[PDB]
Design a protein around this ligand. Structure first.
Ligand SMILES: [Sm+3]
Lengths: 189, 191, 191, 192
């Protein structure tokens, strides 16, 4: 939308551009994924609509050559107080195995640490998703506990991760640029 | 969106087209309203209605187009529709588009959709007692009185008129020519 | 509870006493209803209503006592009361206590509390069309017809008649002596 | 209530009795806390937890009694318990009642309930880094480190240590004798 400055945020790496999904990018994302189409829109709509200073979720479309290939989300409750963010992500099947996962994580963590002035970033992976765990290792996260949840009716264990600003800085390798954030700054605090 | 059949629904009258608001229509609708927090408030509300559709609890905000331009919104909603067969409506129309009878026509459009396509038995609406435009729309569309209510509006008491229109009353007295296109693929979502 | 002044409220009529249900009274109300999920569902609903009390959104589920036995519930509730000055009521009465004039006495009890203690200007109620006893109680107490609503009830459509009672209509029709105790300490909670 | 079997559950240790708070016990717990909005805030919170019980999402706030006096609450919670077999706990103890070893004993009580009766596989807890007592309870009860969090607490950032205890570790190292009465009837309430 042209009535919401978060739509003008761009985060760019040498290979990727991240931005809030417009109608066109959402439909590209659904093609990438392909009840699922509506569930995907519904979820993105609800995240966009629920943005508040003290409870926000930014689902960023990840673009390779201008094409949406997945989503890298950043979120936080009580950010102005905790200075802690959490992330989640998915990447289309045919785009996995090319290091986009690591690069797109790098991109949101730069945004978090350099623009939002976060002090900690968290993530989690199912223990049977080594690719996502490898992304966390590469970005310098430290193990931060075990959790058990219901995943499609069966027990799944999740590994939790913690990345401080200092550890982030020591481990970073990806060049990241942020544009459009000046008008957005008042939304976060 | 190209991945949700409700976006292909079209309701057309002699002067109007109603359809689910796309990204472009939402932004046009916000342009109309602005004729600070209001833009996000508006997107947020539309987004939550689009995302919240459930067979047993839905709201359908339809952008109202006059010669291409989004001039306002005519909504229809219902909780437990398959059981109640009762729908409710609410609406707004940009100030510079008021006084042309678009209000009456847009209400007639969703009533046709509710009765002819959804097979509703009853449609309801409400107006603040000091909204003469909405009250006129209801009278021109042949609704019955259905009660007097009171609510809080901006920290003060506001009285509200309730309206009810039944399917047979509508069948026998309706006068607006309405066409619905793209409903067959939507049909399963409602029943 | 000894920590919430609403528990000290007493409304008394010639044959009835109404009060917020304590633990023992909730359990008697459940005894009454049972003339497997039902006990917990009742408990859960009463707890949630007790817990949800807010000045701008409250529900008062009053146990109705005949000779010490909890026989039914006469509820009063209101959203934005300080602004609207309007209250709503609902009730149920155990099967074997029906047909003895308790329904009208229990409505008179809460109506007096609303108009004389809370200083309400309007009281509303609704009754399903297939509940003529409850309809008659509304007519007996002076309520006027105020619309029709359809809702889902046990997976089937049930039509409700809505009722409206102004303070003047209340006054004109009131016959039952009502006394209210323990309200002074509750006063701040309501406004 | 005499219409909800969870009220007939009793968990006892050498010094303590734990049970779901009746109306009288809620009022004693509030008396203990008071040693303005606080009474109703407490009632409303207990009422909501009592009412919110579902197989797939429950919270069990247990009043802790020392010779009939209500000194605190030891809670046990789980979302999707029948699947995860993981429980979480939280608790408070009246200022007057701290430093007597009740915190460790009350934790031991719910752990035994969780592992011996609910057949939990994992128990978790968290403590603010500036709550040395709660941290010591987790350590005395054999929990291991399970990470670091930050939360907003009264408008300021507060760090919390997370703790995790497995059934095996509990079985090997538990020390407190615990008795649980009134659980048989409650079995179907916790299973699918
Ligand atoms: Sm009729």
């Amino acid at each position: 939308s042209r009535h919401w400055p978060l739509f003008d945020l761009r985060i760019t790496t040498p290979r990727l551009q991240l931005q809030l999904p417009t109608e066109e990018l959402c439909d590209q994302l659904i093609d990438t994924i392909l009840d699922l189409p509506f569930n995907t829109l519904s979820h993105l709509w609800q995240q966009l609509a629920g943005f508040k200073r003290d409870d926000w979720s930014l689902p960023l479309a990840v673009l390779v050559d201008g094409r949406a290939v997945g989503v890298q989300a950043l979120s936080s409750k009580d950010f102005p107080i905790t200075r802690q963010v959490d992330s989640g992500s998915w990447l289309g099947l045919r785009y996995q195995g090319h290091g986009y996962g690591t690069e797109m994580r790098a991109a949101v963590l730069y945004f978090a640490f350099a623009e939002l002035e976060a002090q900690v970033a968290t993530s989690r992976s199912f223990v049977d998703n080594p690719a996502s765990i490898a992304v966390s290792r590469r970005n310098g996260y430290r193990d931060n506990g075990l959790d058990r949840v219901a995943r499609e009716g069966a027990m799944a264990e999740a590994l939790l991760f913690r990345l401080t600003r200092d550890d982030w800085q020591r481990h970073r390798t990806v060049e990241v640029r942020v544009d459009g954030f000046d008008r957005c700054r008042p939304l976060f605090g």
